[model samples]
Each structure stands twice: as C-alpha cells, then as structure tokens.
Target chain A: MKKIDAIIKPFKLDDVREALAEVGITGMTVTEVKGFGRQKGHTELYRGAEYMVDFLPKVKIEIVVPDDIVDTCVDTIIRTAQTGKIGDGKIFVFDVARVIRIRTGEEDDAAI
Target chain B: MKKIDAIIKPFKLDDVREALAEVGITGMTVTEVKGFGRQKGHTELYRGAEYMVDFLPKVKIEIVVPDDIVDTCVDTIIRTAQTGKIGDGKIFVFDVARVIRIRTGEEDDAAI
Candidate 1:
C-alpha cells in the first residue's frame, strides 16, 4: 500500500474529490493546513491595511491506497489541482506498511 | 522510521494524547478535518432549518516514529480512540524515506 499526501489550493478540493471518485477512490482524510512555499504567502488586506502573512491556507488530502493505483492517484491530483500559479502545492508519496479500520479491527490492505 | 496518520473523533484528542504520552511518543502535528464514511455524517439545525451535512468534524494526528515501536504506537491510539462505535476512525502507517526538521536543518531519522 501507499500513502499519498497532497497539499493543494483550498478551492481545488471539490474538483480533486470528483476526480478521485471517478477513479474508484473515495475514502480519504482532509486537513486544513498553513503552507510555506516559494510564494511565502502574500500580502492581504486586513482592516484596510496590507500585511504579509508567512503561511497560506492549504488543504491537505491524505489517502491510503493499493500500491497499483498510487501513480494513477498522484496524476489525478496533479491534473485537478494545478492552476499555473505559485501556490499550487505538492504531493508526497510514502510506502505504507499497514492500515487499521478502528471499527472492525481490520488490518493491512483489507482495512484500507 | 514510520509516519502514522490517525483520524479520530474530535473529542478523543486528549485521550489519544495521553495514551501516546504513556508510550513515550510526544511530538505530533494536529489538524482539524472533516470525515465521511459509513456513518455519512448526520442531520443538524442550520438557521432554524434542518440540513443534512455530508461530512463530520474529526481530528487528525500525524506522528513520525522509529520503526521498531510502530505496533505499540498503533495500539496506543486504538486503545484510546475506540469507543465501540461506528465512527471511531482509522489509522494509516507509512514507511518514510526521509524527514526534515526545518528549524534546525536536521534530516532523516534525527529530524523525526
């Protein structure tokens, strides 16, 4: 199994989700995170004043899938998330040793 | 080293923390998330009108630890988070190729 972690623009989540579902991948964990990248965030208006923020809001999608579909999953995310912009974000893939579904006590790939 | 990502009930965060502390696993990144599974969320009142939401609030805990103690860590989380219910959440383990601690420029296992 493999774990794919993708950090992308918040607005791209819906699009990514639809694409993943189309690929027969539905279950995932989503998190709201502050990302620091080449963009270094940007200036924004606050109380009529401009201020630079160090981190920009990004959505992180964590999905664990069978090894065979790992590449497909990564490609789907990139295709759905890229906006030709600096803060487009990145994806990291890791080898997964196991997975456990707390409700049924399932383990390994079965759990996933 | 391995990175364990656990998504559990929002209210179980403190219990899970104490369990990990008992096992000598301290550092972790926490994030608020939304979960959709067999439970499929629930109905709630919105502006005095009942609405069906597709996602439920959850807490995701990310911890990177040495390989030898992975099972112990997973058990610790399950013991603390499971409530014999449908929405107890899940835990996914991944083999990490590298880890970096940005503040001090520490890399690989030392960084974790």
Candidate 2:
C-alpha cells in the first residue's frame, strides 16, 4: 500500500476533499501545520496562532490507499490544490508496510 | 529507515510521548487530526441534546527511526496508546527515503 501526504493551502481543503471523493477516495486525516518554506509576506491565523507570514500556515492531508490507486489519488490532489503560485505546496508518497484498524484488529489491506 | 505515523486517541498523547522518550525517541512531529474510518462515530450529548460525531479527534505523532528500531518504536507507541477499544487508533509504517535537518543542512541519518 502507499501513504500520501499532501501539504496544501488551507483554503483549498474542501476542493481537494471533493476531488478525491469523486474518485471514490474518502477516508483521510487532516492536520494544521506551520510551513517554513520559501518565505513570503502575509499574515495568517490558524487555531488562534498568528503566522507572521514567513511561517506559513498549512493544512496537511494524509491518506492511505492501496498501491494501484496511489497515482490517481495523488494526481487528483495536485489538480485541486494547485494555484500556480509559490506556496502551492507538495505531495509526498511513501511505501506503507502495514495498516491496522484498532477496533477490529484488522490488518493491512483489510484494515485500510 | 522507517517512519511510523501513529494516529492515536488524543487523551493518550502525554502518556505516549513519555513512553517514547523513555525509549530514546527524542524527536517527533505531532499534529491534531480528524480521523475517519470503519470505527465510525457515536452520538454525544451536547447541551442536553444528542449530536452525531462523524469523525473522531486524533493526534498523529510521526517519528523516523532506523529499520532496526522500527519494531521497538512501534511497540512502545502501541503499548502506551492502546486502550483495547474502538478509538485506540492505528499505526502505519512507511519507508523514508531521506531526512534533512533544515537549519543545519545535515542529511540522512545525521539529520534525523
């Protein structure tokens, strides 16, 4: 299986989620993060914290999908999250060895 | 190397953190996340009324360790976080290609 990590502009979250759902991808995890990348100027607020701008506020979306769906899943994310701008963000793909559903004790393919 | 992303129930945060520290996992990245899965959700009383919770609040803790220690690190997290219940959460193992210490410009093993 594969794990996809997408760091995108917070405003694009709903768009990305919809795009993924169109492809039958629904389960996901979303997190708030500070992105200290190519600095740019602006003010932003996330969870009551003020971002001086250089420290950009980012929303990280994580999804675990079967190997065959990773490509399509990532492409959908890129399409929706891209803004043709500097902080459009990035997507990282990783090999996932195992996935467990705590409630049922299911493993790997079954769990995910 | 391997990266372990543990999506654990929020209340277990401090205990999980302390357990990892005792096992020499000094560095970690944490994110507050919303989890959606087969575990589903339950109704909660809010202001004397019942409301449905579609997703559960979770804390995602990410740690990178050499392959040799992956098992130990994962076990430590599981042992500490597991409450043998529905929302205990899951642990996913991912392959890490490279790691870098941004400020110091160190790379790979040294960087992590």
Candidate 3:
C-alpha cells in the first residue's frame, strides 16, 4: 500500500475530493495546516487590519491506497489541484507497511 | 523508519499521548481533523439550530518511529485509544524514505 499526502489550497478541496471520488478513491483524512513552502507567507487584510502571517493556510489530505493505484492517484490529484500558480501545493508518497480498522481489527486493504 | 498516523476520538487524545509516552515514543505533530467513517455523520443542535454535520470531529496524531519499535508503538496506541465501540478510529503505517528536522538539519531517525 501507499500513503499519499497532498497539501493544497483550501479553496481547491472540493474539486480535489470530487476528482478522487471519480477515480474510486474516497475515505481520506483532511486537516487544516500552516503551509511553509516556496510561497513562504503572504500579507492579507483581516477585519480591516493588515498583518504578516508566517504561514499560508493550506488543506492537507491523507489517503492510503493499494500500491497498484498509486500512480493514477497521484496523477489525478496533480491534475485537479493545479492552479498553474505558486502554492498550488505538493504531494508526498510513502510506502505503507500496514493499516488497521479499529472496529473489526481488519488489516491492509480490507481495513482501508 | 515508519510514519504512523492515528485518527481517534477527540476526547481520547490525552490517553493516547500518555500511552505513547510510556512506550518511549515522543515528538509528534497533532492536528484536528474531521473523520468520516462507518459511523458516518450525526445530528446535533448548534446554537439552538439543528445541523446535520457530515463529519465527526477527530484528532490525528502523526509520529515517526524507528522500524523495530513499530509494533509495540501501534499496540500502545490501539490499547489506549480503543473504547470498544464504533468510531474508535484507525491506524495507518507508512515506510518513510527520509525524515528531516528543519531546525538542526538532522536526518533519518535523528530528524524525527
């Protein structure tokens, strides 16, 4: 199995989700994170105040999939998450050694 | 090394933390996440208004550990997080090719 971690713009979440679903890849964990990347951070107005935030807000999507489907999955994500701009985000892939479903003690693909 | 990702009920965070500590695993990143599992979503009253929440609030813990100790670490997490009911949560393990500690530029196990 493979674990895929994708960090993308918060606004692009829905589109990425739908794209993943189209490829039969659902069941993911999402988290809001402070992303420090090539873009570093940007200044923005908040409540009529301007502040220099140290990190840009980004959404992190974590998904574990069968090994064979990893390439396709990565391709789909890049296609859907690309804005043709900086901060479009990055994808990290890892080889998953195991997976377990707490409810039934299922392991691997069955668990996922 | 292995990257272990555990998503559990929000209330169980402390228990899991202590358990991991007992096993000599520390230095992890925690994030608040929304989990969608067999429990699906539930209805709740928010500010006197009924809302059909599509996801359940969950805590995600990310830890990178040496390969040999993975089993013990996972067992510790499971034993601590399990409530013997639905939505207990899940654990996923991934094989990490590299890890870097940004502050000191440490790599591999030292980085973690």
Candidate 4:
C-alpha cells in the first residue's frame, strides 16, 4: 500500500473530494496546516500596513490506497487543486509499511 | 529511521506526551485534524433535524524516531491514547527515505 499526502488550497477541498469519490475512493483524512513550499510565504497588505504572512494556510489530504490507485489519486488531486495560482500546493508520497484498523485489528491493504 | 503518526482524541495528548517522554522521545509535531473510522462518526440531535458529524475532531501526532526505538514509540502512543472507546483513532507508520533538519543540513537518522 502507499500513503499519498497532498497539501493544497483549502477552498479546493470540495473539488478534490468529488473527484476522489467519483474514482470510488471514499475514505481519507484532511487536516489544516500552515506550511510553505518553494514560494515560501508572501507579504500581504492589512489596512494601510503591509505584513509578512509567514505561513500559508493549506489543507493536508492523506489517503491510504492500494498501490494500483496511488497514481490516480495523485493526478486527481493535482488537477483539481491547480488554479494557475501561486499556492497550488505540493504532494508528498510516503511508503507505508503497514496499516491497521485499531477498532477491528484489520491489517495490511485490508486496513485501508 | 521511522516516522510514526497517530490520530487520537485531542484530550489524550497530555497522556501521549508524558508516555513518550518517559521512553526518551523528546520531539513531535502535532496538528488538529478531523477523521472517522469504522465508527463512522455519529449523529447529534439538533433542533428537529438529525445533524451528522461525519468527522471527528482529532489530534495528529507525528514523531520521527530511530529505527531501534520505533516499536517503543508506537507502543507508548497506543497505550497512552487507548481508552477502549469508540473514537480512539488510528496509528499509521511510514518508511522515511531521508530527513533534513531544515535549520541545518543534518540528514538521515541525525535529522531526528
């Protein structure tokens, strides 16, 4: 199994969700996180003053999937979250050793 | 060597922390997240309509530990956070290829 983690604009979550659901993927986890990528953080104007927004507010989407669907999920997230905008986001894929459902002790790919 | 991530009830954080510290694990990053497992989030009665809380508020605890200590760390988190309750959450383990301290150029196991 593979674990795919994508950090993207918060507002684009709905688009990603729908895309994933259409692909027969229902379960995943999302978290709000402050992160910076190659763009780092940009300065913004508040009132007449300008301040640095050190971290961008991004949504972290995590999915544990059978290896076969990993690429599909990655493409869906990238296409849906892209807006030709600065903070389109970054996707990090990790190799998962195991997955277990604590409630039922389900293991391996079945835990997903 | 290994990165351990656990999603658990937020209130159990203190217990999880103290447990890890006792095992000589010092640092971890925590973030607020929402998730659901077999319990599938319950419903709450609000007004006359049944409101769905399809997501449960959770704390995402992440720690990178030396391979030799991975099992100990995972056990610490599990034992501390386990309450035999419905939303006890889940733990996920990943194999990390490389890690950089970012502040410095420390790599591999040294990054921890």
Most TM-score-accurate candidate? 1
Stretches of model 2 off by over 4 angstroms after superposition: A35-52, A84-86, A104-106, A109-112, B21-27, B36-55, B97-112
lDDT of 1 by residue, B9-59 (tens): 899899989989989987988888877544534322111223655566889
Clashes of each: 0, 0, 0, 0
Residue A83, candidate 4: Cα error in Å is: 3.0
Clashing pairs in 4: none
Q: Which should have the higher lDDT, number 1 or number 4? A: 1
Cα lDDT tens digits, model 3, B27-102, are: 9898889765345343221212235544668898999898789889888888888888878878988767788889
**How do the residues B42-85 of candidate 4 rate in per-residue lDDT, one tens digit apiece?**
43211122364456577888987887887787666777887776
Off by over 4 Å in 3: A37-51, A109-112, B41-53, B96-112
The order by descending TM-score is 1, 3, 4, 2
Summing lDDT over every window of 10 consecutive residues in candidate 2 chain A, give the lowest-scoring window. A39-48
Per-residue lDDT for A35 in model 1? 78
Best by lDDT: 1
Candidate that would win on DockQ: 1
lDDT of 4 at B54: 52
Clashing residue pairs in candidate 2, if any? none
DockQ of all candidates, in order?
Answer: 0.39, 0.33, 0.37, 0.34
Q: What is residue B112's positional error in candidate 1, in angstroms?
A: 13
lDDT against the true structure, per candidate, is 0.78, 0.75, 0.77, 0.73
